Design a binder for this molecule. Structure first.
Ligand SMILES: Nc1nc2c(ncn2[C@@H]2O[C@H](COP(=O)(O)O)[C@@H](O)[C@H]2O)c(=O)[nH]1
Lengths: 153, 148
């Protein structure tokens, strides 16, 4: 199988891959990533990242109940939350141009744009068209080339 | 520093305190901390910590399904797990001198020796006397005076 350290650094790479199919209407100088809820694989994310075009991705944790997530965060990496916590977060986001990714696949039904599946030999992910449409950001459909090619043994 | 980063530090300071009331059958040169499962506040632990007596605490994440948890870890900081993962974890711990703490602990009825409660103006924690009794490590009784 695959160690926690192995998967962490993979997740950060898959996320860099997703970020590249996403456009914000008002592109920031520093992309702000916010890790919300308990997470297993965001340890690599939280070191900061760098996009291929040179833009820095600043990452930090925020409280679920933070009323201004959607404002403080450009991208949001969602960890293990409960029904109440989730509704909080996705209400905090509603209206704003924000990309949401989840560490576990269960959250796609309930508000997340991309959901990861870190188990297995590779990291695959899934998307939700409803959540993406209402997101406020633009996503090129080629982003699934990455989800399909990661699922291909 | 956000509220998570400050609580992350408080979680550090609290775990260090709790450590100072625990003893290992054979005390190790470096204390092995294992962060296991989804966590919010383990970011301070993971940066490394040093005890009052100067000992390095080395912290690293390990898988829930890791079968060698009992021998790889001196202390386990347990994040979110379900009943199967919990049971699995403690099967891997039984028979080894391992101090166990968990980031969430409304109940503290079954599982870890101590359970944190990071919510609120300050960090509190409760003790599970049964887990403490049969764990392998000695716990100076005075620590319960630091509990809720
Ligand atoms: N403060 C302190 N307590 C110790 C030390 N070594 C052992 N102890 C405590 O003494 C206990 C032994 O208890 P006893 O043998 O009296 O029944 C150990 O489990 C531990 O709690 C030490 O170096 N310092």
């Amino acid at each position: 199988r695959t160690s926690i350290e192995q998967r962490s650094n993979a997740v950060s790479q898959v996320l860099l891959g997703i970020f590249s199919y996403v456009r914000w209407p008002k592109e920031p100088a520093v992309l702000q990533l916010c890790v919300v809820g308990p997470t297993e694989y965001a340890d690599g994310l939280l070191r900061g990242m760098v996009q291929a075009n040179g833009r820095r991705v600043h990452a930090e944790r925020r409280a679920v109940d933070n009323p201004d997530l959607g404002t403080l965060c450009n991208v949001i990496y969602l960890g293990v939350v409960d029904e109440r916590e989730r509704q909080q977060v996705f209400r905090s986001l509603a209206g704003h141009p924000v990309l949401s990714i989840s560490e576990r696949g269960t959250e796609c039904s309930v508000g997340s744009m991309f959901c990861l599946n870190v188990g297995g030999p590779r990291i695959t992910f899934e998307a939700n068209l409803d959540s993406i449409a209402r997101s406020g950001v633009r996503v090129h459909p080629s982003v699934l080339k990455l989800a399909r090619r990661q699922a291909t043994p």
